[PDB]
Amino acid sequence: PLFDYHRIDQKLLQNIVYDALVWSTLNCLLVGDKSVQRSGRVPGVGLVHLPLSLLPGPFPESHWKQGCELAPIFNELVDRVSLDGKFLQESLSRDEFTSRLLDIHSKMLQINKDIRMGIVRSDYMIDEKTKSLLQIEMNTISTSFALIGCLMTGLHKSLLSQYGKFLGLNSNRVPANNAVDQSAEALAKAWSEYNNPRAAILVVVQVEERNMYEQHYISALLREKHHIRSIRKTLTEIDQEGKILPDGTLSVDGQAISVVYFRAGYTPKDYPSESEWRARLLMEQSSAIKCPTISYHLVGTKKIQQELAKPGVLERFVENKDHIAKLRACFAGLWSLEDSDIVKKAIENPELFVMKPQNNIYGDELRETLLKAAYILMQRIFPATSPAILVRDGNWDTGHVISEAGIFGTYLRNKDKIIINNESGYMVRTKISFGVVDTVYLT
Amino acid sequence: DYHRIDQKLLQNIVYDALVWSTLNCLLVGDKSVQRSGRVPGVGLVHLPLSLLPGPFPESHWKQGCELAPIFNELVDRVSLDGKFLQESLSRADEFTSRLLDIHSKMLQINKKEDIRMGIVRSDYMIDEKTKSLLQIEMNTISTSFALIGCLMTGLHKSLLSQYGKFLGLNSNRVPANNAVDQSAEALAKAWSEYNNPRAAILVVVQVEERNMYEQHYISALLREKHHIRSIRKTLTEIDQEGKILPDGTLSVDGQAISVVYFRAGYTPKDYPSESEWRARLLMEQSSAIKCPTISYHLVGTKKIQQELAKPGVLERFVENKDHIAKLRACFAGLWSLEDSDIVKKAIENPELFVMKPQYILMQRIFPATSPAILVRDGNWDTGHVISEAGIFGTYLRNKDKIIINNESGYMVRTKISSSYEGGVLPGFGVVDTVYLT
Ligand SMILES: N[C@H](CCC(=O)N[C@@H](CS)C(=O)O)C(=O)O
Numbered sequence: 080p081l082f083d084y085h086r087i088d089q090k091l092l093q094n095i096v097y098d099a100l101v102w103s104t105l106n107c108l109l110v111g112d113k114s115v116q117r118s119g120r121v122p123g124v125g126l127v128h129l130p131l132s133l134l135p136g137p138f139p140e141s142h143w144k145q146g147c148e149l150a151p152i153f154n155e156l157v158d159r160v161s162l163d164g165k166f167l168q169e170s171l172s173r174d175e176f177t178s179r180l181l182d183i184h185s186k187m188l189q190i191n192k193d194i195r196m197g198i199v200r201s202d203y204m205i206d207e208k209t210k211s212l213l214q215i216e217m218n219t220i221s222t223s224f225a226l227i228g229c230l231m232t233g234l235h236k237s238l239l240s241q242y243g244k245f246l247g248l249n250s251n252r253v254p255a256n257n258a259v260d261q262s263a264e265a266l267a268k269a270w271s272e273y274n275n276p277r278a279a280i281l282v283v284v285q286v287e288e289r290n291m292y293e294q295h296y297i298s299a300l301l302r303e304k305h306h307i308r309s310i311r312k313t314l315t316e317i318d319q320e321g322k323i324l325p326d327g328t329l330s331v332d333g334q335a336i337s338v339v340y341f342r343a344g345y346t347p348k349d350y351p352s353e354s355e356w357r358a359r360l361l362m363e364q365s366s367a368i369k370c371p372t373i374s375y376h377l378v379g380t381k382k383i384q385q386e387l388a389k390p391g392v393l394e395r396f397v398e399n400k401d402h403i404a405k406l407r408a409c410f411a412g413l414w415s416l417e418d419s420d421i422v423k424k425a426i427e428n429p430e431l432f433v434m435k436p437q438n439n440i441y442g443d444e445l446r447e448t449l450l451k452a453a454y455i456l457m458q459r460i461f462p463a464t465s466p467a468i469l470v471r472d473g474n475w476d477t478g479h480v481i482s483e484a485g486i487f488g489t490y491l492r493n494k495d496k497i498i499i500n501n502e503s504g505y506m507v508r509t510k511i512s513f514g515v516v517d518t519v520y521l522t
Numbered sequence: 523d524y525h526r527i528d529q530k531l532l533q534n535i536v537y538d539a540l541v542w543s544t545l546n547c548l549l550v551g552d553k554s555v556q557r558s559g560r561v562p563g564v565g566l567v568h569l570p571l572s573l574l575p576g577p578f579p580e581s582h583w584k585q586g587c588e589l590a591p592i593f594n595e596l597v598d599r600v601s602l603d604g605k606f607l608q609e610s611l612s613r614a615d616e617f618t619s620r621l622l623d624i625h626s627k628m629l630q631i632n633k634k635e636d637i638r639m640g641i642v643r644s645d646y647m648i649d650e651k652t653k654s655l656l657q658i659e660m661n662t663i664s665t666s667f668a669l670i671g672c673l674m675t676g677l678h679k680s681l682l683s684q685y686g687k688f689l690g691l692n693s694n695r696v697p698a699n700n701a702v703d704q705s706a707e708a709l710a711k712a713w714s715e716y717n718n719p720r721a722a723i724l725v726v727v728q729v730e731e732r733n734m735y736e737q738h739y740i741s742a743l744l745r746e747k748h749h750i751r752s753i754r755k756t757l758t759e760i761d762q763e764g765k766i767l768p769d770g771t772l773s774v775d776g777q778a779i780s781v782v783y784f785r786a787g788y789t790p791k792d793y794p795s796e797s798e799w800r801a802r803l804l805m806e807q808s809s810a811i812k813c814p815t816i817s818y819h820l821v822g823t824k825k826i827q828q829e830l831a832k833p834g835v836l837e838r839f840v841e842n843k844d845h846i847a848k849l850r851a852c853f854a855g856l857w858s859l860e861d862s863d864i865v866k867k868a869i870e871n872p873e874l875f876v877m878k879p880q881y882i883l884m885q886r887i888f889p890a891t892s893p894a895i896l897v898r899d900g901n902w903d904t905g906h907v908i909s910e911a912g913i914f915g916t917y918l919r920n921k922d923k924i925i926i927n928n929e930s931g932y933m934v935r936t937k938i939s940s941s942y943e944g945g946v947l948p949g950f951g952v953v954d955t956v957y958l959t
């Protein structure tokens with residue numbers, strides 16, 4: 080144990096936790112309590128610290144470097160796949176939700192309708208077999224925790240400033256984070272690119288938003304730092320409110336909308352009725368720059384990401400061989416009816432493989448294979464468990480947790496000028512065995 | 523006249539204020555949540571606030587600001603007169619005289635406090651005839667709301683940047699407020715005069731503190747800005763955990779303490795037993811800088827606060843006759859060691875004065891009213907309210923060297939009551955700022 084944090088004497092942790100709880104209040108590491116009924120609609124009431132790991136867990140410096148250089152590679156890959164409507168339409172037209180999303184994509188295709196931007200997130204985990212950094216998810220739409228992840232960097236750096244050498248650790252190895260500034264800056268640059276100085280930013284939000292303070296903070300940054308107004312509306316409000324003018328400008332609550340920032344619309348529970356599908360359509364048709372576009376949203380679906388990971392598919396959207404190499408190194412293997420992996424690599428050694436739907440099947444039952452629900456074959460990831468202190472509604476407890484590190488990218492282009500393509504900070508979600516937020520403690 | 527504002531627009535401002543409050547830690551423990559005054563980060567709620575500032579003449583603002591060093595210097599002087607204080611408060615309620623006790627014990631060992639400081643607050647009203655700024659109270663000890671006041675300034679400037687247009691108001695006109703930074707600064711310079719690099723600041727704190735964030739924020743400036751450490755402890759923790767070192771240094775929980783910052787101990791309720799009275803005496807006898815000493819507590823009590831106000835008393839502690847004019851001007855008529863101005867000019871016109879048949883005697887305070895929006899537990903309502911302006915002062919000196927004597931930001935306290943929907947506490951009222959002129 081190098082810091083198996085469970086060892087730390089229970090007297091010194093009453094104090095660290097105490098300080099951790101102070102800092103979170105002072106710095107708005109706060110969310111609506113689930114237990115309080117209005118805390119997702121009324122700000123300023125029913126507030127509570129984000130559930131949190133007290134001290135950061137370890138992540139090799141090299142694999143953190145690796146994730147950092149992937150960030151702009153994934154950005155350009157997401158833009159490239161999104162430009163292929165036939166790949167997208169072929170792949171996915173095989174789920175009422177997805178099929179509704181594809182409609183909207185078709186409609187645009189049908190109508191030949193660029194300033195393109197993204198604020199996206201690639202989630203990784205370290206795998207104990209290969210010792211590799213592996214991509215777990217690419218989030219192309221409405222990525223949370225740009226603020227949270229970067230208050231956490233601050234929290235843990237504070238804690239370590241106070242308690243470090245008393246524990247063997249230096250804040251230095253909690254990496255610097257700018258996720259939320261990069262985010263608001265990507266937005267401000269897009270608004271600039273549209274070059275309507277009268278335009279506001281639309282931020283599409285959920286009816287119930289306990290995490291509303293992350294959003295207000297980005298809006299505060301936009302307003303005070305970038306001098307740009309933003310307005311927050313639910314999809315059903317955009318259906319009642321929103322109009323397109325005869326020249327294709329979006330007008331929501333009496334103002335031009337140059338940028339549409341989604342922090343909603345990624346779940347089917349966001350579209351209770353036809354009003355919300357109208358609104359998504361209305362907005363997509365408009366000349367507003369969408370953060371992100373419907374094509375981007377589709378790239379991010381489970382189905383597209385699986386298809387990307389199959390042998391030879393990825394390499395269709397990437398010409399750079401160094402990048403090709405980098406991508407494939409973080410991609411967990413995934414396959415269909417290949418006799419070679421999928422009869423027999425997996426039959427002998429059912430150890431990795433898991434079969435998943437396009438129940439999971441593992442281990443001895445994965446001799447499903449000996450007989451040819453779970454439609455594709457992929458490589459098993461074995462995660463790093465580590466001892467943690469978990470602070471929740473003011474109370475701590477110990478557990479052994481796994482961590483998922485997500486790297487933000489921002490991207491902005493106007494037909495062939497790349498204005499932004501960036502690694503833009505991180506967050507970490509740490510969970511038992513929906514968990515807590517965290518950081519990493521490099522190598 | 524904010525009651526005259528379209529109700530759905532009002533709801534937009536309140537929504538923005540709630541949001542700003544949350545982002546910028548204008549938060550306390552919710553009274554409704556029982557752990558919230560002990561456990562940080564749980565059960566938070568925004569401060570009750572006035573949505574938007576009442577008007578305040580600018581001339582009277584400047585008047586209240588000029589007066590802060592002058593009250594800073596007067597508190598200190600009265601405090602130096604142990605015999606006066608002793609004359610005026612032997613009379614009695616048990617708490618006041620348990621403070622005299624401790625005062626006598628210090629005069630007795632002829633105790634020396636070479637470095638003296640204050641973080642104090644003069645609370646004022648504009649009275650709606652004569653149009654004069656009048657002192658309501660002089661708070662010498664444990665003055666709350668330096669963070670909260672200067673947050674309220676941020677709030678109202680931000681709302682006015684958004685809405686002031688429509689409204690006809692410029693954010694400009696809400697006075698700039700640095701209360702919390704000047705608070706930490708005074709404590710920083712104090713630690714620095716004392717000159718023990720390894721010493722911490724002790725903040726003396728109530729068992730239950732829903733306003734703890736104000737205190738932690740001050741400790742964060744101390745720690746991050748000034749690189750000074752602090753610990754918090756209740757009076758009974760000090761009794762259990764502290765002691766005087768052979769050279770006189772205070773040591774609490776094995777830490778040397780150079781500065782004792784009172785955020786508790788101004789109410790009998792802070793002394794349930796003889797533990798906390800020990801703790802109070804122990805720190806007084808030590809050589810730690812008290813913020814404030816026992817003499818300053820005394821200068822701010824009801825009985826003394828009245829005594830200076832009566833005619834003549836005030837000349838004994840002030841030399842500058844301007845400063846005597848400034849003080850008399852915000853001094854409201856104050857009387858009775860025997861006066862024929864009692865019940866005379868007072869049973870006959872009792873709508874001015876206060877306090878005889880019909881704890882002594884003042885000119886009556888007729889406050890300006892303004893329509894206001896009040897926000898409490900995420901809910902707003904309209905209300906007609908009165909405001910009380912608190913001007914902070916910071917003072918520090920080392921023998922004859924005045925290191926700091928200074929006006930240091932403000933708070934405003936605004937409440938409905940008497941002619942409308944309430945009940946007497948203030949229901950601590952709400953937090954406010956002012957709009958000049
Ligand atoms: N309710 C929004 C929705 C955003 C969201 O669901 N984000 C997912 C991204 S799809 C995440 O874990 O990033 C929030 O928490 O800010």
Ligand SMILES: N[C@H](CCC(=O)N[C@@H](CS)C(=O)O)C(=O)O
Pocket residue numbers: 643661663664665666667728731733736785786788
């Ligand atoms: N709990 C104390 C309360 C101290 C206090 O109530 N101060 C009052 C009266 S001395 C004030 O209005 O300043 C704090 O916040 O530090």
Ligand SMILES: N[C@H](CCC(=O)N[C@@H](CS)C(=O)O)C(=O)O
Pocket residue numbers: 580583584587588694696697698699
């Ligand atoms: N409003 C602040 C001033 C802070 C202060 O003391 N303000 C009074 C002078 S006391 C004022 O007239 O603003 C400013 O505008 O700079």
